[PDB]
Symmetry: C3
């Protein structure tokens, strides 16, 4: 259980990091985005 | 503890999925979004 | 393990909440955003 939860949390941390990058790009008009 | 953490993680996976969909809609101009 | 996972999940819940707010601001044109 714990091990699979660590796995899920680590996938979520990646997803959230990618979201943060894309949201910042949208807010700042980065590179015409 | 584990059970409530599984609950929290599963709510987060949904939230993150909805965010991903909304962010893609914003990036692609999907449906005038 | 559990304690550090609770920590990670709680940081993620904050990050996701901030993302949700920023994504809503982008969708609604809130305050010229």
């Amino acid at each position: 259980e714990v091990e699979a939860l660590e796995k899920k949390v680590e996938a979520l941390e990646f997803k959230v990091q990618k979201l943060e990058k894309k949201v910042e790009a949208l807010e700042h008009g980065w590179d015409g985005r």
